Design a protein around this ligand. Sequence first.
Ligand code: OLC
Ligand code: OLC
Ligand code: RET
Ligand code: RET
Ligand code: RET
Ligand code: RET
Ligand code: RET
Ligand code: LFA
Ligand code: BOG
Ligand code: BOG
Ligand code: BOG
Ligand code: BOG
Ligand code: BOG
Ligand code: NA
Ligand code: NA
Ligand code: NA
Ligand code: NA
Ligand code: NA
Lengths: 273, 273, 273, 273, 273
Amino acid sequence: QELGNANFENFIGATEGFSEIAYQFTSHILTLGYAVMLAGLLYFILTIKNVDKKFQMSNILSAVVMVSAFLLLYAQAQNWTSSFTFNEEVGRYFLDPSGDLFNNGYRYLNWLIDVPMLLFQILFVVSLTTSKFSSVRNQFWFSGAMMIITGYIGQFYEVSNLTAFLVWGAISSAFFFHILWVMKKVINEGKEGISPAGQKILSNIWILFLISWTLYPGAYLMPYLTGVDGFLYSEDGVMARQLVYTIADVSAKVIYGVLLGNLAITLSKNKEL
Amino acid sequence: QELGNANFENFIGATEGFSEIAYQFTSHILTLGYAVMLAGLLYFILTIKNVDKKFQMSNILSAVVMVSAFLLLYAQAQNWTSSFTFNEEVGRYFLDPSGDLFNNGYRYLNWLIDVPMLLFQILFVVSLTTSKFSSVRNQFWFSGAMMIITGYIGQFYEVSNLTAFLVWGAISSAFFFHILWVMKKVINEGKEGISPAGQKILSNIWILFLISWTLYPGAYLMPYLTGVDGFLYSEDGVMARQLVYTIADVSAKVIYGVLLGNLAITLSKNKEL
Amino acid sequence: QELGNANFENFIGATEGFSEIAYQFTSHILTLGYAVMLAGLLYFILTIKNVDKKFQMSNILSAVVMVSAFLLLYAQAQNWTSSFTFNEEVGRYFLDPSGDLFNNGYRYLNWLIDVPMLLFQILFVVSLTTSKFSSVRNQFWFSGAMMIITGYIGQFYEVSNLTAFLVWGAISSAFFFHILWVMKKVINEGKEGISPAGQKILSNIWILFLISWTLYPGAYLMPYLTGVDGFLYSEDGVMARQLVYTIADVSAKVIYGVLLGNLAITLSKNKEL
Amino acid sequence: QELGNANFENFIGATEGFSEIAYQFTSHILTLGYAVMLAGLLYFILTIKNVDKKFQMSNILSAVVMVSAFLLLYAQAQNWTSSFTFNEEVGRYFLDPSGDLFNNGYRYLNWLIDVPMLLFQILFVVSLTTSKFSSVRNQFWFSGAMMIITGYIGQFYEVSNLTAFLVWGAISSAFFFHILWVMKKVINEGKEGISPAGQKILSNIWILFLISWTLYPGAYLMPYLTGVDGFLYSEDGVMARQLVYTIADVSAKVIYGVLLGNLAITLSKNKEL
Amino acid sequence: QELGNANFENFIGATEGFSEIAYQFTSHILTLGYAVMLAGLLYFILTIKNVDKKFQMSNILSAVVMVSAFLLLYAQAQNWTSSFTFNEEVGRYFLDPSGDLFNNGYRYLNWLIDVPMLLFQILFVVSLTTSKFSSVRNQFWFSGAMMIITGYIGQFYEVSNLTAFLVWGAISSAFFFHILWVMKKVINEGKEGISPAGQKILSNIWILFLISWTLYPGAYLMPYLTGVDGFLYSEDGVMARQLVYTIADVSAKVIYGVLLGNLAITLSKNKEL
Ligand SMILES: CCCCCCCC/C=C/CCCCCCCC(=O)OC[C@H](O)CO
Ligand SMILES: CCCCCCCC/C=C\CCCCCCCC(=O)OC[C@H](O)CO
Ligand SMILES: *C/C=C(C)/C=C/C=C(C)/C=C/C1=C(C)CCCC1(C)C
Ligand SMILES: *C/C=C(C)/C=C/C=C(C)/C=C/C1=C(C)CCCC1(C)C
Ligand SMILES: *C/C=C(C)/C=C/C=C(C)/C=C/C1=C(C)CCCC1(C)C
Ligand SMILES: *C/C=C(C)/C=C/C=C(C)/C=C/C1=C(C)CCCC1(C)C
Ligand SMILES: *C/C=C(C)/C=C/C=C(C)/C=C/C1=C(C)CCCC1(C)C
Ligand SMILES: CCCCCCCCCCCCCCCCCCCC
Ligand SMILES: CCCCCCCCO[C@@H]1O[C@H](CO)[C@@H](O)[C@H](O)[C@H]1O
Ligand SMILES: CCCCCCCCO[C@@H]1O[C@H](CO)[C@@H](O)[C@H](O)[C@H]1O
Ligand SMILES: CCCCCCCCO[C@@H]1O[C@H](CO)[C@@H](O)[C@H](O)[C@H]1O
Ligand SMILES: CCCCCCCCO[C@@H]1O[C@H](CO)[C@@H](O)[C@H](O)[C@H]1O
Ligand SMILES: CCCCCCCCO[C@@H]1O[C@H](CO)[C@@H](O)[C@H](O)[C@H]1O
Ligand code: NA
Ligand code: NA
Ligand code: NA
Ligand code: NA
Ligand code: NA
C-alpha cells in the first residue's frame, strides 16, 4: 500500500494488524491519559486558594495545560479507534484509511501550549538570583518552539526517510539540551535562600523534570530502539510508545504541577504544609 | 469467528446474541452509572465548604474520582451500543466488530486513578495513631497499582486461557488482601479519640468498603461463578457483571465519599450534622 | 418482524411508521425535555445563596436531579432519532433497527437517582414533628426503589405479555401508594409551626406532587388507555406518552424544586418573597 | 416523493437543491446563532454581581434562556447539515432524508422556555404601579403558551395546507398582540419613579422588543412574503428565514438581557454605569 | 467536477489531493487553534479578580471571545476531516463531498462576535480624552460589520470569480483602514495620563493589533500571493492559510487579551505585577 510520510503505527496496522490486546491497551492508555488531565484540571482549580495570591498564577497555568492536554489526548483516543478496524476473518485490527491515518503529530503541535507554559510557570514560584526573568522566559520559549517544530517535521519521516527522521531529531535534541541547561540554572537559583522543605521539593522537581521530559525523545525513537526488525518494530512498539507518552504526560504535567503547588504552599507566608 | 484474547461478552454476542432485555438493560445500567458519577461530581464540589478547611481535600479527591468515573462509564456505555447490533431476522443483538470488541479493560486502567485516590482521601479525615501517613499512602498506592495491573492482564484471558486468567487473578487477590489489611488498621486508628457518632460512620465505611471492593473480583469471576456452561455463562452473566460493576462503582466511589464527608462534618469544629 | 420484549413505539414504527408530525413532535418534546433540565441545573446552582445555609442542601439535590435528568433525556432524544428513519417512497419514518430498538427503560433506571433525591430533599426544608427523619428517608428510598424496579420489568412486556405488564404494574402501584401516604404525612408535619404563606406553598407542592407523579403510571398505560385497537395504540399514543413524560418531568423535578426553594426563602431568617 | 406536512426548506432541497452559498450561509448563520448564546451565557453569569441582589434574578433568567437557546440552535445547526447532502453531478445540496427532514418546529417548542422567561425577567427589574405582578405574569405566560402552540401547529402546514397555515398563524397573532399590549403597560409603569437614564433604557428595550419579536411572524411567513412563485419561495427565502431567526434570537434574548442588566445597574444603590 | 462558488481548498482536494503532511498538519493546526481558545477561556475567567472592578469587563469580554473562537475552530477542525478522505490507491486525501465542501466562511460570520468585542473591550481599560466612548464604539462596530460582511461575500468567489473576489476584498479593506485609524487614536488617547509601564504595553498592543489583524487579509489572498499557478496555489497554500489564521487568532484574541489584562493591572490602584 502507498502510505507516504506516515507514522509506523499505520504500517504495522496495514501489514500485520493489531491483536485484541495491542489495540485495546492502546485505546485504554490513551483514555486514562485524557481522564487524568480532566481530573487534574479540577484539582488545580479547586486548590488555587491554598497558596498566596502571588503563587496562584502557577495553579492557573497548570489548569491551562490540563485543558490543552485533555482536548488533545481525547482527540487522539478517538483517532486511534477510527484508524484501526476489526477484520473478522483473521481476528486482528487493520488500518482503516476512511478514519484517516494515525499521526502522533497532534501531540506535537499541542506541546506549543504545554511546553512554554510548563517552563514559564516555575518562574512564578521560585525567585531567580543572577538570571533575568524575561531572559529565561525568552530562552525557554524560543528553544521550546524550535524543539517541537523540528521534532514535528522529523516524525513524519520515521518510516519514509530514516535520515530526515534522525537529523531533525538531532537538531531537536540540541534545543532540548539548551532547555535542560536553563531549567537546571533556574532550579539552583530557586533553591538559594529558601527553607529546606522548599529545597527538597525543587530537588524532586528537577529529577521529575529530567526523567519525564527525556521519555518524549524515547517515544520518538521507540520503533527503532531494538534496531532493524527488532522486538519494538511491531504492535509491542506501538503499545510501548503510547504508554511512554502517557507516563510522560502525567509526570511532566500533573505531578510537576502538584509539586510546584506544594512548593508554593511552603513558600506561602500564611499557610503551612 | 476468531476473537482471540477477548472478553466473554463478545463470545455470547457472537454466538447466541443478546435479547432485547439483556442488551437494553446493560445499556441502561451503564447509563445510570455515568449519570450518577456526574451528579456526584456536582454534589462534592457544592458541599466543599460544609467542612473545615483541613477536610476539604477529601471533597476534592471525591470530585477527581467522579471525573474519572464519569468519563470512563460514558465511554463504556457508548462501547456497549457500538459493539452489538440488532439482527432483524431473529430479533437479537449480535457482535458488530466494526464497533470494536467490547472490553472491560477500560475500567481497569482508570482504576489507576480511582483506587489510589479513594484510599488516599480517608487519610485526610481520620488521624492515625500508630501508623505514618506517608507509609500507609505508599502501601495503598503500590499494592493498588499491582492489584490493578495484574488483574488487567488477567481479564484478557478470561476465555482464551483460563489458567492465566486464574493465576493473574490470584496474584491480584494477594495485593487486594494487603489493601484490606491496611484499610482496617486505618479505620481502627481513625476511630481512636473521636466522638461515638464518628466511630459509627467509620464502622459503616468499613462495611461499605469491604463489600463494594469485593464486588470487583466478583465481576472478574462472574461468567464462571456457576461453573462451566453454567447459568451465568450467558447473556444473564453479562447483565450481572455490569450490574455488579455499577453497584460497586456507586458504593465504592459516591456513597463512600458521602460517608467521609459526613465524618468530616462531625469532626469539624464549626459545623454540625 | 421479530421484536420480542420491546416497547410499543417499535411496533407502530415497524408496521405503520410515523408521519412527519408524529416523528418531529416526539423529537421536539424530548429536546425541550433535556433543555429544561440543563436550564434548571443553572437556576438551582445560581440561587443556592438565596436561602439560609441549612436549606441549601435542597438546592444542591435539585441540581443533582437536573444532571441525571439532562443526561438521560439527551440520550433518549438521540435514541428516538436513531431508531426511526425516513422512507422516501411512502414519506413516513419506520423502525431502523441499526439504531437499536427504542426503549423507555432508560428513564426508569435513572429514576433510581431522581425519585430518592426528590423525596429526600423536602426533608431539608420542612421540619418533621412526630416522624423520624431517618425513618421517612428509609421508607421513601425502599418503596421508591421497589416501585421503579418492578415497573422497569413490567414495561418490557407492554406488548409481548400484557399479563406480566399489568401484574408488575400493579405491584409497582402498591409501592407508589405507600410513597403518596408518607409524603402526605411529611407535608402535614411540614405545615406545623410555619407561616400561612409557607403552608400555602406546601399545599401547592402536594397538589403538584400528586398530579405530576401520577402522570408516570399514565405514560406506562398510555397505549392501552383507549383499550384494544384504540385511538392511542398508534403514533398518536406514542406522541402522548412522551408529552406526558416531559410534562411530568418538568413538573416533578423543576417546578417542585422551585417551589421548595420558595418555601426555603419564606422559612429563611434573612429573606422575604 | 411525498414529504407530507414538512417545512418548505425540504421542498426546495428536494427539487432545485441549494447552491454552495445558500447551503453554507444557512450553516454559518445557525453556527453564529448558538455561539452567540453560549458566549451570552458566560456574560450573564460573570456579570451577576454587577447589580444589587434584588436584580440578580434577571441575570439568572437571562442565563437560563441562553442555555435553552444554545442547546436548540446547536441541535438545529446539526439538523441543517444532516438534512442536505452534496450531489457531485450537478454541484448542489439536495434533501437527504436519511438525516430526517428539516423542521423549524425545534425552535417553537423551546420558546416555551424562552418566551415565558424573557417576559418574566423584566418584572425583577422594574416596579409595577397600577398592574399586579401575578396578573401580568399570568397573562404573559398564558398568551405566550397559546401564541407558541398555535404557531407550532401552523408551521407544519406551511406547504401542505396554506389555509391551516394562515388560520393558525392568525390565531397566534392575536395572542402576540395581547403580549405586546401587556409589555407596553409594563414598560410605562417601569419608567415611573426612576432616573431619566433608566427611562431611556426602557424606551430602547421597548423598541428592541417590538422589532425583534415581530421578526418571528416575519420568519413564519417568509416563503410567501413575495406571494406565489415569488423570489422568496426559493433558496433565497430559506437563507432569509434563518437570518431573520438569528437576528431575532440575538436581539430578543442577548441584547434584551444586556439592556435589562444595564437598567438594573442604574437602579442599583451602589453602582454607577 | 462542478464545485461552483467554493473555496480553493476544495479544488486542490478534488484535483491533486492532499499529501499526508498537508492533510495532517491542517488538522493539527486547527486542533491547536481551538485548544488554545478553551485554555484562554479558563485563563481569563481565573484572572478576573487580578484587576480593579472597573477593568473586569475586559476579562469578561476576552472570555466571551474565547467561547466564540473555541466553538468555531472546533467546528472547523471537524469540517476539515469530514471534507477530505484518504484514497488507498494513490495515498492522498481527496475531496469527499458527502462531508460537505470546506468553507472558511464559518470564521467570517463568527468574527461578527469577535471583532466588535475585541475592539470594544479596550474601551474598558483605557480612558479616552478628546474622543467620545459611544462614537468610537459605533465606528468600530459599523466598520467591523461592513469589513466582515463584504469579505464574507468576497471569499465565495475566490476561485469562481476573481474579479468579485478582489473588488469585495478592496471594499472590505477600506473599512479595515478606518478601524486601524480609530484604534490608533484610541491607543494614543489611552497613553495620555498613565505610567510609562502602561504606555509601553499600549505600544505593544498597537504593534500586535496591526500585525495580527493584517494577517487576516493575508489569509484571504493567500492562494494568489505567488500569482497564477504559483507555489501557494497548492496544498502548501492550503497549509499556509490555516497556519496564518491560527497565528492571527492566537495573537489577535488571546495575546491581545493578556496584554490588556496586564495594562489593567498597572492601572489598578491596589495591584502590582
Ligand atoms: C459608508 C457606507 C458604504 C457602503 C459600501 C457598500 C458597497 C456595496 C456595493 C457593492 C457593489 C460591488 C459588487 C462588485 C461585483 C463584481 C461583479 C463582477 O466583477 O462580475 C464579473 C463578470 O461576472 C464576469 O467576470
Ligand atoms: C474601493 C473602496 C470604496 C469603498 C468605500 C467605503 C469607504 C468606507 C470608509 C470609512 C467608512 C466610515 C463610516 C463610519 C461612520 C459610521 C456611523 C457612525 O458610527 O457614527 C458615529 C456615531 O453616531 C457618533 O456617536
Ligand atoms: C507536556 C508535554 C511535554 C513536556 C513535551 C515535551 C516534549 C519534548 C521534550 C520533545 C522532545 C523531542 C526531542 C528532544 C527529540 C525528538 C523530537 C521531540 C520533540 C519529541
Ligand atoms: C472505583 C473502583 C474501584 C474501587 C476498583 C476496585 C478494584 C478492585 C478491588 C479489583 C480487584 C481485583 C481482584 C482482587 C482480582 C481480579 C482482578 C481485580 C483487579 C478485578
Ligand atoms: C423525576 C421522575 C419521577 C418523579 C418518576 C416517578 C415515577 C413513578 C411515580 C412511576 C410509577 C410507576 C407506577 C406507579 C406503575 C407503573 C410503573 C411506574 C414505575 C411507571
Ligand atoms: C427567544 C424567542 C422568542 C422571543 C420567540 C418569539 C416568538 C414569537 C413572537 C412568535 C410569534 C408567532 C406569531 C405571532 C405568528 C406565527 C406563529 C409564531 C409563533 C411564530
Ligand atoms: C478574532 C478575529 C479577527 C480579529 C478577525 C479580523 C478580520 C479581519 C481584519 C478581516 C479583514 C478582511 C479584509 C481587510 C479584506 C479581506 C476580507 C477580510 C474580512 C478577511
Ligand atoms: C515578550 C515575550 C517575547 C517572546 C520571545 C520568544 C520568541 C518565541 C517565538 C518562537 C518562534 C519560532 C519561529 C520558528 C520559525 C520556523 C523555523 C523552523 C525550522 C524549519
Ligand atoms: C536508535 C536510533 C538509530 C536506530 C536506527 C535503526 C535502523 C532501522 O532500520 C530500519 O528498520 C526497519 C524496521 O525493521 C526496516 O523496515 C527498515 O527497512 C530499516 O531501514
Ligand atoms: C474460581 C471459579 C472459577 C472456576 C473455573 C471453571 C470454569 C471453566 O469452565 C469453562 O467454561 C466455559 C464456558 O462454560 C467453557 O467454554 C470452557 O471450555 C471451560 O473451560
Ligand atoms: C387498565 C387498562 C388496560 C386495558 C387492557 C386492554 C388490552 C388491550 O388488548 C391488546 O390491544 C393491543 C393493541 O390494540 C393488541 O395488539 C393486543 O393483541 C391486545 O391484547
Ligand atoms: C400574508 C402572506 C400570505 C399570502 C399567500 C400567498 C399564496 C402562496 O401560494 C402558493 O405559492 C407556492 C410557492 O410559490 C406554490 O407552490 C403554491 O402552489 C401556492 O399555493
Ligand atoms: C492582489 C493579488 C491577486 C493576484 C491575482 C492573480 C491571478 C491568478 O489567476 C488565476 O490563477 C489560478 C491559479 O493558478 C488559475 O487557476 C486561474 O485560471 C487564474 O484566473
Ligand atoms: Na476501531
Ligand atoms: Na447497538
Ligand atoms: Na432519524
Ligand atoms: Na450536509
Ligand atoms: Na478525513
